[PDB]
Design a protein around this ligand. Structure first.
Ligand SMILES: CCCCCCCCCCCCC/C=C\[C@H](O)[C@H](N)CO
Ligand SMILES: CCCCCCCCCCCCC/C=C\[C@H](O)[C@H](N)CO
Ligand SMILES: *C(=O)CCCCCCCCCCCCC
Ligand SMILES: *C(=O)CCCCCCCCCCCCC
Lengths: 8, 268, 283, 60, 283, 60, 268, 8, 8
C-alpha cells in the first residue's frame, strides 16, 4: 500500500 | 506364492465358525471400508453399549434356495434376514438402537460342464418398488421384511388391483433392480459375479452404512443383498437343470444401545 | 492434493511388446474394473495432456438454481364462500423431476441451501381497473409452529419464524440456509419405516408409510400478498429455485431410468420400457 | 480479511487473481469457492481385499 | 515489448543522395512489399512522432457490443389453434452483417464472449387494459438438451442449463461466456464437409452441406415471458448484443465486397458490381 | 488483490493511475485490459526465404 | 513366477494390434536372431529407405482354413501371403527393393477331448517341386504365388500330363516336405508343434534371411510357412471332426528401397 | 493488513 | 498488502 496511496 | 498361497483359496473364521473355499474370485470390501465400532467422536447415545462379540459375530447360514432356468432373482435385507439368528436376533430386539457390519458369503457350486453367471450386489438403502398403481409407498412392514427367506424378482410388473383389500407388497422387476433404475448399472454398487466356469462363491465385507451413527434396526434396513442371474443356468442338455444357492452371513463389530424389554414385532 | 482443475495424466509413448505381462486379460467376477490405459494394448505416442475435470466436480455438477415449485396466490376480496388466496407448500425437492434425478445419483448428501424466489403477476379479468405495486410475504413455518389459516391471521406476525418481505418488480429474493438435518447427512433413500408394528398392539396403530421418516421433515413455506385487495383481481406466482452449495455426497446409485411416480421409488405400469429397438449387428 | 486467489486463465487477451470478502457471519451465506479436490476411484473401481497388479493375472 | 499505445517511429532528417543504393527500385514478383519510408525517396526533416496505433489493435477494433439478433415473444392466452409465443434462436454471428464482416477479416479467432440483452415491450391492441411488470426467462439450451415445445413445459425448470431471469425496466442483462470451441480456435471459414460420401454406400447417405461442420454448433437461446397472460396483449422484443473480449485472430482475409447471401461465401446474381464508374485520368 | 496501472493521459487539466479488482473466479468474467502488444508485419509484408535489404536490388 | 506370470500366457502388441494367448508353448526366435533394420556396414542401395513402421508392422489375419481328418497340410510364402495386406502390400509394390522380418502366430484351439498335432515349420528358401515329369523348374509365377490363400500338400505325386497346355503348378507331397527331403527331418528348421492337449497356438519370430542384404520382394520369397498334421485330428467318436486354423502375421522392421510407379503384377 | 489478506 | 497490490 505505501506507494499505492499517493498523497497531496 | 512360490510356497503355495492363492486368490482362489480362502479360509474365513469368525467365532466358532470357519468357512473354506477353493474357488473364490478374491474378496470385496465395500467402498474400501472394513467394519468398525462406533468412535467416541461420532458417538451419540450416552449409555454403555452392549457388544455381543463372538456370541453374535459368527456365521449364520440361511435357507438354501434353488437356481433354475426360470429363476429371475432373489433379494434380502440386513439386518432383517438375521432377525431370528441366535444371540444376534435377541440382542437386536432387546435394544432400541443397534449397528452392524457383515461378511456376506454366497455359495453356489456346479461343474465344469455347467454354465451361468450370478450378479451379487450389496445395495445401501435398497428401497424397492410397490405393487400398486393407485397409491404409493404403501408396502406393509410385514411384506417388506421377509426375514431369512427373502423375496424374489419378477420379470413383469403386474399391478395389484384388489383395491378393497390390497396386497400391499413389493413388485420388483428384475431389469429395473426393483427400484426404477437399470440393472446394467448396479455394478456401481459393491459386488461380485459368480460365473460358474470361474468361481463358486462370492464374498463381500460390508461396513455399517447410514446417515446416522446408530439407528433402529427393527425399523430400518441398512443393506440390501440382491442376487440376479446375469447369464442363465445351463447344463449339458437337460431342459430342467437346477443348482442350489446358499447364503451364509456374519454380523461384524456389532453394538447395541438403549436396553429395555423385548420388542415383539407383528411379523404376520 | 490433486485439485478438480488439475490437468489429467499425460499419455506416454509406448512401443512393441512380446511378453508374459497380460494387461488385457482380467476377471470381472472379482468385482474390480481393469485400470487399463491405451499404452497397454496399442502403441502410443507421447501427449502432454491439458484437459481437466473441473466442470464435473460435485459442486460444479450441482451449481445451478433449479425450479422446485410454483406457488399461486392472489389478492381478491375474501367473501362468505371463497377467501383471499394465500399459499402453503411443503418443502421438498421431489415435486419436480430434474434436480431430484441429479441428487438421486447418490444415497446421502450434505449441503447449505440457497433459495431464490421469482415472482410474477397478472390481471385475471377483462376489466380495466388497476392495482398498486404488491408486497409479498414469504414465511417459513418449521414443523410445530402454527400454520396460517387465513391470509391475515395472527401467525403472519412472525415473531420467531423467518419471513421475507418481497417488493414486486425488485430483483428476485434470495436467502441461504445451513445444513439443517437431524441426521449427519440427508437421506435420499430410507429403506424403512417410522413405526414398529407391535403384535401385542392392534395393527391399525402399528402402521406407517414405506420409506417415509418424519411425517414433516422441514416444514412449510407460506406465502401471501400483504396488500389489502384491489377491486381488480391480480394473480401472482412464486417460482422457487433451489441450489445446493458446499455439497458433499456419498454412495453412488444408478440414475432413475423410468418416470418418477410419487415421492418414493415406485413405478407405474406402462412407463417401464425406456430403451428402444436397435439390432445387435447394426451400427 | 480479504482473500486473494488465482484464476485458471482460459483465453488470454503473469498469473491473474480475484478477490473475495465474506460479509456474513454464517458460513452458509458464503458463496461456493469451487476450489475443490479430486480423489482416486479405487474404492469403487477396485474394492478388492487383495491389491491388483494390472500386468499380472487377475486370478491366480 | 512494443505496446499498441507506444508512439510510432520518428521521421529522421535526410539530405541529397547520389549513389548506387536503390531503395525505390524493387520486384513485387517476390511476394514482398517494399519497406520504404519518406526519407528514402525525398529529403526529410526531423519529426518527433506522437501518434500511436492504440485504437486499431485487435481488441480495440472489436471492443463494441454489436446486435446479432432480435427475438420476439409475447404474452397472450394459449388457444386451441395459436399458442402463447416463446422464442428460439440458434446462436450465431451471421444473422446480421456488420460484426460478421469484421470477424471475417480473419480466418480463425479465439475469444471470451459478452452477451448483453435489451428488452422492450409494447401493447398490440387499441384496448385500454393493462399488464403488470413482466419477467423474462432467457434459457441457454446446449446441443443435446431438451428443446422447449411450450412456453410452460418441464424444460424451463433449467436444473442444469444456465438461465437468466430478467425483470422488465431494470438495467439490460449481461453475462460472460468462455472460449467454448471444440477446436483450438473458431473457424470463420471451413473448406470442407462433415461427411465423407462413400462409393460402397448409397449417395443420399454420403451427403452434406458445403462448408458446414457440426449441424448444431453452439445450441440455442430460448426466451419466454414467465408471467401468466394478461387479458391485454403485450409483445416484447429481445435484442442481443455480442462483444468479443480477450480476442486473438489468425490468417487475414480480404473483406466481404458484395452482399452476404446465406451463412456461406455464396453470392447472389445482380449484387456483384460494387465498384462505380470513374475514369483513368480523372482526379 | 488490487491491480494498479497507469493511464496514457490525453488532454491535461506526475503519472495518473487507475485501479482494478477482479470480482469473479472465471477469467472470462474479467473486463478487457487493453494493455496490448504490437508486432512487426514481416510475416505478411516480407514472407520471403531470403531476408531483404531495401537499398539493394530485390532481384540479383 | 510366485506373483502369477507363465510360459503359457502371452500378450503380443505391434502397432494398433494386440494378441492374447492363455495356452502357448513359449515362443521361438528363428536361429536366435530377432528382426532388425539394415545396418550401414551391410547396406547396399544408396537411397534413403522408406520405413513404414506402425502402418505396416502390425498383425494381419489371413483367411481361416479348416482342419479335418483328411487334411494333408498347408503352405504359404512370405512376403507373398501379405502382398495385399494394407499399407504393407502398397509399400511392397511401389518399391523395387524391400526387406522384412515377421512374427507368425498360428491359432488352433479345440477341447480337452480332441486330439491331434500340427507341425509348424518356417523354411528359409522353401523351393517346392513341380507337377511335371517331362520338364523341370517350370511352375508359373501365378501358380507359385497363391497369395494369402496359400497352397496345400497332397499325399500323392500325380504328374501333370496335358503336355499341350500344362498345368504348370507345384505338386508337393507331404512326406517329402514337397521338396524331395523327408518330413521327419524338417525339425532342423525353426518350428513349433501345436499339440491339442498342450497348446492352442504357435508363435515364431522370423528374421530377414537371404544371401543379400535386401532384394526384390515381388520376385523372391524369403520364407515358407509349412503346416502339416503330424498326428491326425480326432474327436470323441465323430467320423468327421473339424476345427479351424487361423494364421495371423506381422511384418517386423521392414524397409524399402528404389521408389517408382506401382508394380501391377499379372497374378492370374 | 499482511495477515488480514490471506492468499491462495 | 504490499504483494496483494500488483502495479504496472
Ligand atoms: C424465509 C425462507 C426460509 C426457508 C427455510 C428452509 C429450511 C428447510 C430446508 C429444507 C431442507 C430440505 C433438504 C432436502 C430433503 C432431504 O434431503 C430428503 N428428504 C432426505 O433427508
Ligand atoms: C444464459 C445465456 C447463455 C449464453 C451461452 C452462449 C454459449 C455459446 C457461445 C456461442 C459461440 C459462438 C462463436 C461463434 C461462431 C463460431 O465462431 C463459427 N461458427 C466458427 O467456429
Ligand atoms: C479484511 O477484510 C481487511 C480488509 C478490509 C477491506 C475493505 C472491505 C470492504 C468493505 C467490507 C465491509 C464488510 C461488510 C459486512
Ligand atoms: C486485494 O484485493 C486486497 C485488497 C482488497 C481491497 C478491497 C476490495 C474491495 C471489495 C472487493 C470484494 C470482492 C467482491 C467479489
Amino acid at each position: 500500500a505505501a506507494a499505492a496511496s499517493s498523497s497531496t | 506364492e512360490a510356497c503355495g498361497y492363492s486368490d482362489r483359496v480362502l479360509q474365513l473364521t469368525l467365532g466358532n465358525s470357519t468357512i473354506t473355499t477353493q474357488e473364490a474370485a478374491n474378496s470385496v470390501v465395500a467402498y474400501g471400508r472394513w467394519p468398525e465400532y462406533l468412535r467416541d467422536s461420532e458417538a451419540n447415545p450416552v449409555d454403555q453399549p452392549t457388544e455381543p462379540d463372538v456370541a453374535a459375530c459368527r456365521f449364520y447360514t440361511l435357507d438354501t434356495v434353488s437356481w433354475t432356468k426360470e429363476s429371475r432373482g432373489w433379494w434380502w435385507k440386513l439386518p432383517d434376514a438375521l432377525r431370528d439368528m441366535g444371540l444376534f436376533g435377541q440382542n437386536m430386539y432387546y435394544h432400541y438402537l443397534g449397528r452392524s457390519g457383515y461378511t456376506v458369503h454366497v455359495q453356489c457350486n456346479a461343474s465344469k460342464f455347467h454354465q451361468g453367471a450370478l450378479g451379487v450386489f450389496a445395495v445401501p438403502e435398497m428401497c424397492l418398488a410397490g405393487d400398486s398403481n393407485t397409491t404409493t409407498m404403501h408396502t406393509s412392514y410385514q411384506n417388506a421384511n421377509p426375514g431369512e427367506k427373502g423375496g424374489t424378482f419378477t420379470g413383469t410388473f403386474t399391478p395389484d388391483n384388489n383395491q378393497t383389500s390390497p396386497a400391499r407388497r413389493f413388485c420388483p422387476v428384475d431389469y429395473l433392480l426393483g427400484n426404477g433404475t437399470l440393472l446394467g448399472n448396479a455394478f456401481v454398487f459393491p459386488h461380485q459375479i459368480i460365473n460358474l466356469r470361474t468361481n463358486n462363491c462370492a464374498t463381500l465385507v460390508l461396513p455399517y452404512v447410514n446417515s446416522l451413527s446408530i439407528d433402529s434396526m427393527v425399523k430400518h434396513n441398512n443393506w440390501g443383498i440382491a442376487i440376479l442371474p446375469l447369464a442363465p443356468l445351463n447344463f449339458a442338455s437337460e431342459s430342467s437343470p437346477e443348482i442350489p444357492i446358499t447364503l451364509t452371513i456374519a454380523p461384524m463389530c456389532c453394538e447395541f444401545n438403549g436396553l429395555r424389554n423385548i420388542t415383539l414385532p407383528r411379523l404376520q | 492434493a490433486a485439485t478438480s482443475r488439475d490437468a489429467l495424466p499425460n499419455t506416454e509413448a509406448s512401443g512393441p511388446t512380446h511378453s508374459k505381462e497380460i494387461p488385457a486379460l482380467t476377471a470381472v467376477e472379482t468385482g474390480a474394473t481393469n485400470p487399463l490405459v491405451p499404452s497397454d494394448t496399442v502403441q502410443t505416442r507421447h501427449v502432454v495432456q491439458h484437459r481437466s475435470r473441473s466442470e464435473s466436480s460435485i459442486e460444479s455438477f450441482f451449481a445451478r438454481g433449479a425450479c422446485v415449485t410454483i406457488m399461486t396466490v392472489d389478492n381478491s376480496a375474501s367473501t362468505t364462500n371463497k377467501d383471499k388466496l394465500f399459499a402453503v407448500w411443503k418443502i421438498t425437492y421431489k415435486d419436480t423431476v430434474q434436480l431430484r434425478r441429479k441428487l438421486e445419483f447418490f444415497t446421502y448428501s450434505r449441503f447449505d441451501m440457497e433459495l431464490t424466489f421469482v415472482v410474477t403477476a397478472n390481471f385475471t379479468e377483462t376489466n380495466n381497473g388497476h392495482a398498486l405495486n404488491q408486497v409479498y410475504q414469504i414465511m417459513y413455518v418449521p414443523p410445530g409452529a402454527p400454520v396460517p389459516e387465513k391470509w391475515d391471521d395472527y401467525t403472519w406476525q412472525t415473531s420467531s419464524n423467518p419471513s421475507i418481505f418481497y417488493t414486486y418488480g425488485t430483483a428476485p429474493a434470495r436467502i441461504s440456509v445451513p445444513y439443517v438435518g437431524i441426521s449427519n447427512a440427508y437421506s435420499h433413500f430410507y429403506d424403512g419405516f417410522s413405526k414398529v408394528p407391535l403384535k401385542d398392539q392392534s395393527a391399525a396403530l402399528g402402521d406407517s408409510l414405506y420409506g417415509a421418516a418424519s411425517l414433516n421433515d422441514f416444514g412449510i413455506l407460506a406465502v401471501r400478498v400483504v396488500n389489502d385487495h384491489n377491486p381488480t383481481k391480480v394473480t401472482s406466482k412464486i417460482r422457487v429455485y433451489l441450489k445446493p452449495k458446499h455439497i458433499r455426497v456419498w454412495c453412488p446409485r444408478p440414475p432413475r431410468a423410468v418416470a418418477y411416480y410419487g415421492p418414493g421409488v415406485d413405478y407405474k405400469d406402462g412407463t417401464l420400457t425406456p430403451l428402444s429397438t436397435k439390432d445387435l449387428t447394426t451400427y | 480479511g480479504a482473500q486473494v486467489s488465482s484464476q485458471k486463465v482460459g483465453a488470454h487477451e503473469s498469473t491473474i487473481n480475484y478477490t473475495t470478502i465474506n460479509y456474513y457471519r454464517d458460513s452458509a451465506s458464503n458463496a461456493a469457492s469451487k476450489q475443490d479436490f479430486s480423489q482416486d476411484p479405487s474404492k469403487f473401481t477396485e474394492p478388492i481385499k487383495d491389491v491388483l497388479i494390472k500386468t499380472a493375472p487377475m486370478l491366480n
